[PDB]
Amino acid sequence: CIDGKAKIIFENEGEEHLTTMEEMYERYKHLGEFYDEEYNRWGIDVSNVPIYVKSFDPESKRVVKGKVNVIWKYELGKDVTKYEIITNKGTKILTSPWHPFFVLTPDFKIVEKRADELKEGDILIGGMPDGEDYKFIFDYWLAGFIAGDGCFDKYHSHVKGHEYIYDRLRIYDYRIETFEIINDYLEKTFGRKYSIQKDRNIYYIDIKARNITSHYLKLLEGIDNGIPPQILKEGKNAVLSFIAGLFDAEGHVSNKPGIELGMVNKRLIEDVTHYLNALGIKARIREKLRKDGIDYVLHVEEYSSLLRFYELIGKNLQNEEKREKLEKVLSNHKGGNFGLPLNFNAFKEWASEYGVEFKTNGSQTIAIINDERISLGQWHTRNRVSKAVLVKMLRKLYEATKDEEVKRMLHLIEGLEVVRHITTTNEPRTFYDLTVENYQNYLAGENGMIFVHN
Ligand SMILES: [Zn+2]
Numbered sequence: 087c088i089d090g091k092a093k094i095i096f097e098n099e100g101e102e103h104l105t106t107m108e109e110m111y112e113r114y115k116h117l118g119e120f121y122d123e124e125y126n127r128w129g130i131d132v133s134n135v136p137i138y139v140k141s142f143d144p145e146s147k148r149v150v151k152g153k154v155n156v157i158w159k160y161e162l163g164k165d166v167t168k169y170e171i172i173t174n175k176g177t178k179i180l181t182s183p184w185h186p187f188f189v190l191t192p193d194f195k196i197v198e199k200r201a202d203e204l205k206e207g208d209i210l211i212g213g214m215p216d217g218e219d220y221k222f223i224f225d226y227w228l229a230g231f232i233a234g235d236g237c238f239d240k241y242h243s244h245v246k247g248h249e250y251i252y253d254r255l256r257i258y259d260y261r262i263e264t265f266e267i268i269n270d271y272l273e274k275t276f277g278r279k280y281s282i283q284k285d286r287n288i289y290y291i292d293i294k295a296r297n298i299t300s301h302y303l304k305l306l307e308g309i310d311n312g313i314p315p316q317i318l319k320e321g322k323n324a325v326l327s328f329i330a331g332l333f334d335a336e337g338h339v340s341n342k343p344g345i346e347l348g349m350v351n352k353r354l355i356e357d358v359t360h361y362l363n364a365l366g367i368k369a370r371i372r373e374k375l376r377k378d379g380i381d382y383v384l385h386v387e388e389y390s391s392l393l394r395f396y397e398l399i400g401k402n403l404q405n406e407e408k409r410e411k412l413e414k415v416l417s418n419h420k421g422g423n424f425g426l427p428l429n430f431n432a433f434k435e436w437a438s439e440y441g442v443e444f445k446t447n448g449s450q451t452i453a454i455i456n457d458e459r460i461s462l463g464q465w466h467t468r469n470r471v472s473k474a475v476l477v478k479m480l481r482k483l484y485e486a487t488k489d490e491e492v493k494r495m496l497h498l499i500e501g502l503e504v505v506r507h508i509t510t511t512n513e514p515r516t517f518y519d520l521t522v523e524n525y526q527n528y529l530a531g532e533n534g535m536i537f538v539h540n
Contacts, residue, residue, distance in 0.1 A: 087181065093105070094530040105320070107518040112348040117131070119159075138151045140152070148216070158519040176534060177532070211502065222402045226320075232331075262289050313328070343387075351382070355383070371533065422474040424470055426474070449468075473502065
């Protein structure tokens with residue numbers, strides 16, 4: 087069982103939701119909750135209600151859809167010490183002493199260890215990519231772009247015989263190219279196009295067509311409390327297209343390298359951050375002290391995550407200037423130095439099955455794949471290797487073999503997180519848990535997503 091503030095993503099009839107554990111319980115309470123007198127816990131049978139979460143299958147080592155049968159609510163007191171676990175990524179997990187986590191050992195074996203057995207430096211199995219295909223939908227991109235550079239208001243004609251009040255949508259951008267793409271879409275989708283206006287360095291279109299304004303007003307309804315439900319309920323393709331539009335509008339690519347997306351809409355930024363993490367992209371939020379307030383900035387700096395960000399969102403960016411910069415900072419990456427404690431000989435055994443040859447140059451390790459030489463840092467001598475270096479080698483190994491087992495290893499590595507801090511407490515805490523059929527674990531967490539076991 088874990089703290090009620092942990093975020094979780096789940097679906098019904100293909101309809102996805104993103105809420106905290108508390109809210110998930112509150113949402114199905116009407117179905118009637120029963121009290122388990124023996125275990126002093128409250129439950130709710132949702133076995134008949136199709137509820138699915140993201141589950142990890144230790145066997146095939148991939149992410150699968152897990153069936154939830156019961157949602158539990160617990161009241162833990164001072165008789166039990168709670169364990170707070172924080173990873174390098176900032177991911178937070180407050181749980182019970184016996185609650186087990188999936189741990190990757192140096193020998194590349196997955197084992198379960200309870201929260202009280204964990205120690206700084208342990209490798210936890212966290213949110214990871216599913217490798218599936220994703221489709222770009224322009225309609226949702228435009229909704230995301232409007233969310234960032236659009237403005238809705240009321241236009242009063244005030245003309246005699248035509249005194250009506252219409253909804254007006256004005257979209258702004260510093261590039262005229264953006265509007266040529268939008269007009270092309272608007273013309274074919276709504277049979278309407280707009281002359282591109284200019285007002286001192288800034289371009290914009292003024293839209294008053296009832297069918298277009300209402301179409302987008304309805305898609306963005308609820309943006310104040312997070313990702314709009316109309317979008318979110320539609321799944322990955324809609325949400326990802328939406329984020330891309332959001333990034334095109336306000337996203338920034340730095341030379342760290344990395345990407346940043348800041349807005350004053352805390353709830354929206356939080357939701358996007360948790361949604362990206364659930365897809366294997368290690369994003370985090372940072373607060374930027376501003377003039378009259380605070381800006382919530384989503385950050386992605388992990389090389390492997392940036393690369394993944396590029397494949398799911400980056401390549402679909404409409405602003406060719408940001409897209410190109412991202413590709414450049416990516417093809418020129420120095421290297422994330424944080425080394426994962428993994429044994430080289432164990433990896434060597436596994437990789438030999440593919441014909442991978444290994445050479446050494448002093449303390450440096452080198453892998454040979456298709457005549458190409460790839461540096462693996464000082465792996466064979468330190469039994470430590472950086473996620474970035476290992477991700478680069480595995481992408482090469484997959485490109486040369488097209489073998490699903492390799493792809494699976496790659497995704498596993500991309501999702502890894504490392505325990506940085508572990509604290510305790512005995513304060514009033516109401517925890518929740520989910521009984522997942524077969525897999526017995528689901529994806530959830532605060533400022534990150536990690537696979538928690540039943
Ligand atoms: Zn008026």
